[PDB]
Amino acid sequence: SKQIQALRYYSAQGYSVINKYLRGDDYPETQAKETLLSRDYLSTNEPSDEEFKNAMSVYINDIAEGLSSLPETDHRVVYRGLKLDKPALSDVLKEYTTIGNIIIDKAFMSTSPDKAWINDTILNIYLEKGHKGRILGDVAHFKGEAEMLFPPNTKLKIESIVNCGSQDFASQLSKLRLSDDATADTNRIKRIINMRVLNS
Ligand SMILES: NC(=O)C1=CN([C@@H]2O[C@H](COP(=O)(O)OP(=O)(O)OC[C@H]3O[C@@H](n4cnc5c(N)ncnc54)[C@H](O)[C@@H]3O)[C@@H](O)[C@H]2O)C=CC1
Structure with missing residues (x-):
């Protein structure tokens, strides 16, 4: 099509x-x-x-x-790495680190069902049945890393924020699958944000 x-x-x-x-x-x-x-x-x-x-x-x-039009899948969580500690993003950082806050992402939202790409912020995004995200598969240009893409205007609830340097953070990080690419370094991670897509 x-x-x-x-x-x-x-x-x-x-x-x-x-x-x-x-x-x-x-x-x-x-x-x-x-x-x-x-x-x-x-x-x-x-x-x-x-x-x-x-x-x-x-x-x-x-x-x-x-x-x-792409097939739905049974995924219930996906991951997204963001760089939020840039000065120009201080507002965006405040929004994402306000517990309970509801954020509307206006762009298409790229996530991975498989692993998180290490960055200052790791998003741990829970999904409810019938959400609008779709696995790209062979529609993706560069293949071999999975991608679940969401259309504009995904609404995300900020459930908890876990800053680096605690046992809680260490445990939560250990339970994520992280990218182990050529420059991977988990010591760069400042926070995990646990979020939920709000469908409808
Ligand atoms: N970020 C990820 O974990 C995923 C990215 N990819 C691939 O990575 C490539 C680039 O995609 P993305 O990094 O997703 O680019 P993007 O355009 O979705 O990310 C935007 C970047 O812009 C900044 N930004 C400015 N305003 C923002 C806002 N309001 N909300 C969130 N970020 C904001 C942030 O620093 C963020 O790191 C694509 O080719 C995609 O296929 C694949 C899977 C997951």
């Missing part, structure tokens, strides 16, 4: 424009327009803001529909 093809492109390269665009961050505007022209969402090479915005919507919607 054209929608699965759009999701393949998202995976390969489109995520680099679309997630910033959906978060409201500065994004590469010329690159977005070229992608829309290239994939025929735009015919004018000088779209109005309206035409551009509408075209981006169809393109994002195509990616989400392709995602939605």
Whole structure:
């Protein structure tokens, strides 16, 4: 389907424009327009803001529909590594480290069912039956590491935050499967955040 093809492109390269665009961050505007022209969402090479915005919507919607069309799986937890201790993210860090808080992730959300990629923040994300996440499998561009992707606007409850340097943290970390790639170092981990996707 054209929608699965759009999701393949998202995976390969489109995520680099679309997630910033959906978060409201500065994004590469010329690159977005070229992608829309290239994939025929735009015919004018000088779209109005309206035409551009509408075209981006169809393109994002195509990616989400392709995602939605993939088979569901029985996964009940997934993992995501984030770098949250950058100064420019101090607000985002506050949101994610407020116990009980409810966060709406505006971009597509990339997670792994298999392992957490080590970063200052490890997200331990519990899922309830019927959630919108989908295993990409061979739709993914680079394969051989599993990926469960979620469409825009996933709602996450912050259940508990576990800072480094305690037995609790040590135990919880030991129960995660962590990436053991060329630069893996668990001593870089500042926190675990236990979260839950709120469906519906
Ligand atoms: N992060 C992960 O654990 C997973 C990533 N991957 C792969 O990694 C590659 C990159 O994906 P991601 O790292 O997921 O990129 P992303 O665009 O989803 O992550 C954004 C990064 O931007 C920053 N950021 C700014 N605003 C944010 C916000 N409001 N919420 C969360 N983070 C915010 C954070 O520092 C974060 O580390 C992709 O090719 C994907 O296939 C695969 C599985 C899991």
